[PDB]
Amino acid sequence: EAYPPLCSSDAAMLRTAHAGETGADEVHLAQYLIRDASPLRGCLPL
Amino acid sequence: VGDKLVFLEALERRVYQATRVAYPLIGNIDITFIMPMGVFQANSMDRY
Numbered sequence: 854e855a856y857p858p859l860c861s862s863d864a865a866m867l868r869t870a871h872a873g874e875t876g877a878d879e880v881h882l883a884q885y886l887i888r889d890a891s892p893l894r895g896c897l898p899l
Numbered sequence: 900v901g902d903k904l905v906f907l908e909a910l911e912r913r914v915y916q917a918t919r920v921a922y923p924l925i926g927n928i929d930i931t932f933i934m935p936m937g938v939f940q941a942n943s944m945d946r947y
Binding site for chain 2: 863864865882
């Protein structure tokens with residue numbers, strides 16, 4: 854088995870954000886992001 | 900601190916008062932820094 858990881862299908866989802874972190878959960882204008890089922894959310898440092 | 904007992908001193912006590920001498924414990928730290936001037940985008944996904 855393999856848990857679904859987090860990845861970006863393209864490099865255009867970094868349009869809208871807040872504070873100092875990018876925000877894109879599962880939707881995009883032309884792509885989609887796979888949510889990480891595993892609780893390893895301590896990645897992508899600011 | 901922790902479980903032991905220690906003491907400390909200072910340079911602002913009765914000694915070393917009103918002395919015209921160079922201040923010790925002085926260090927200089929330099930870090931290299933880059934500076935761009937504006938790079939045009941190469942992909943068309945950054946303008947929509």
